[PDB]
């Protein structure tokens, strides 16, 4: 039975076989192949448990599909209408909505971005490459952050198209300012780790009831 | 520490709920079963699952059901459970569900509503009863099928419902899953072809054109 590994088995014995190796931080020494070292912790373990970082291909064929180079200057490739599910007529598909206060919405990069999915949705349905997995500031470990509505404020809400490698089908929210101008206007407040231990902390208190 | 009811809901936490079968929690069914699945993936789908969020089982009943009694039933979103726009309209389109994808759902093939394959519970907007063993050869309900010819859903977000945030993608099929099986658009999927991490990512979806 398929043993759940870093590369496929089929890579070896070079599984990073073209690829430059700059920094022993990153898997073949390459930060656009996201760290070595994976999560150990909820929920980000959670989110992780079901990510094969290269799906079935080796790091030099993932590359080649995904991005305009195998060598170093290579960039990831994104896909159309910011990378929301396109339907029949090739149309993204999506909706302006309002985000309730209380909703709890987290995101793998910086607070310049504009992306974010709700709480503890699998990076397999996110549609991210392996580098945005790479931690950049020590006290938010593989870039990951948590947030909560504070005030109601309007995003692109909709399904994510598979790429990467991975099937997607998550929902993204693409908000009309960064995440930085939402917490400075009262928007979003950042949670620690605390306020996303328990499962409780995943439910939805703020939606009411029919009648 | 995560616990089945939440503590303010003791000493009596099935007050006012009137016990018919101890397979189910408060012997409820509508509040699920009390053995939780312990293999994955249903227990990946399941660990972020705050049953009831922060309600007891009759505050939970009394806000999502028409009656806390044995009588009530479960009141469903609108349309279709779609998550809707500022404009109160649902937010989906048609697509075309490519060969190789995998998906998932919890009820009987009778039904139209699936998931990508391992979705969170909390994602998927269902009430605790989604979870009941129905058929002992599916236990908690739970199929997974993969994609075998192409064909057109409805596709779109996941509203909050059952006091959880939603916000999963769901397909809504234009035939049930039986149809589809017998047309040839769906296959089932044994549990030993969604065991390992590279079962869940995507070899049939193309990269761009460069
Ligand atoms: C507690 O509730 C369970 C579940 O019952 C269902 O849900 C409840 C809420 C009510 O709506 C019921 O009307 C529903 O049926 C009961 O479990 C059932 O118990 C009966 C009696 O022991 C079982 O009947 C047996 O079934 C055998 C075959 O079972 C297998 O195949 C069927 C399909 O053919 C499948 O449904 C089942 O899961 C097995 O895979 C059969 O050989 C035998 O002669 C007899 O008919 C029935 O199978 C049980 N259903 C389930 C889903 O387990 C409990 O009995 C009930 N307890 C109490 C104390 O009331
Ligand atoms: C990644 O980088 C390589 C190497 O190019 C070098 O680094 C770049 C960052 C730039 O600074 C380049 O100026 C620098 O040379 C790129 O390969 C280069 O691509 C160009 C265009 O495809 C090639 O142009 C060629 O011209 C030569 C003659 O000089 C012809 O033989 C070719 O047929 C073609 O006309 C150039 O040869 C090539 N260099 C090498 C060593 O292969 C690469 O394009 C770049 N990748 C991306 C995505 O930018
Ligand atoms: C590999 O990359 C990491 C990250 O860029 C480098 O780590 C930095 O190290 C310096 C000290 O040398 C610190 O001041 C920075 O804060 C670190 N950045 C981090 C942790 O994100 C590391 O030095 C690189 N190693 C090699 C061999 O190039
Ligand atoms: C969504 O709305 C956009 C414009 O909305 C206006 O400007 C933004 C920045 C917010 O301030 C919003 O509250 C305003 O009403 C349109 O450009 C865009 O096309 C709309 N998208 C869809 C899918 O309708
Ligand atoms: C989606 O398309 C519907 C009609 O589609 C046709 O009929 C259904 C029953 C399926 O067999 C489908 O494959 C066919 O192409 C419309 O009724 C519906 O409004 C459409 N939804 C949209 C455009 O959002
Ligand atoms: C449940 O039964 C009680 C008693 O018969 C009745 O008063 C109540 O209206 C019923 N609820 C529903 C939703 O029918």
């Not at 700059?22 to 999560?39: F, S």
């Not at 099937?167 to 306020?195: A, C, H, K, W």
């Not at 499962?199 to 939805?204: G, I, L, R």
Request: charged residues 20%; hydrophobic residues 35%.
């Amino acid at each position: 039975h398929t043993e759940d590994s870093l590369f496929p088995a089929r890579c070896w014995p070079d599984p990073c076989a073209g690829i430059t190796f700059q920094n022993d931080t990153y898997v073949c020494g390459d930060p656009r192949l996201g760290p070595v070292v994976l999560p150990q912790k909820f929920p980000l373990n959670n989110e992780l448990r079901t990510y094969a970082r290269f799906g079935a291909l080796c790091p030099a064929e993932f590359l080649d599909k995904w991005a305009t180079d195998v060598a170093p200057n290579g960039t990831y490739i994104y896909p159309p209408a910011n990378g929301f599910a396109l339907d029949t007529e090739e149309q993204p598909i999506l909706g302006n909505a309002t985000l309730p206060v209380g909703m709890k919405l987290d995101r793998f990069g910086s607070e310049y971005g504009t992306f974010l999915a709700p709480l503890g949705a699998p990076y397999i349905e996110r549609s991210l490459p392996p580098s945005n997995l790479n931690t950049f500031d020590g006290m938010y470990p593989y870039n990951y952050h948590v947030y909560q509505v504070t005030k109601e404020f309007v995003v692109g809400l909709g399904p994510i198209a598979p790429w990467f490698e991975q099937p997607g089908m998550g929902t993204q929210f693409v908000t009309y300012t960064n995440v930085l101008g939402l917490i400075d206007d009262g928007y979003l407040r950042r949670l620690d780790e605390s306020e996303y231990a328990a499962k409780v902390e995943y439910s939805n208190p703020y939606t009411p009831g029919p009648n």
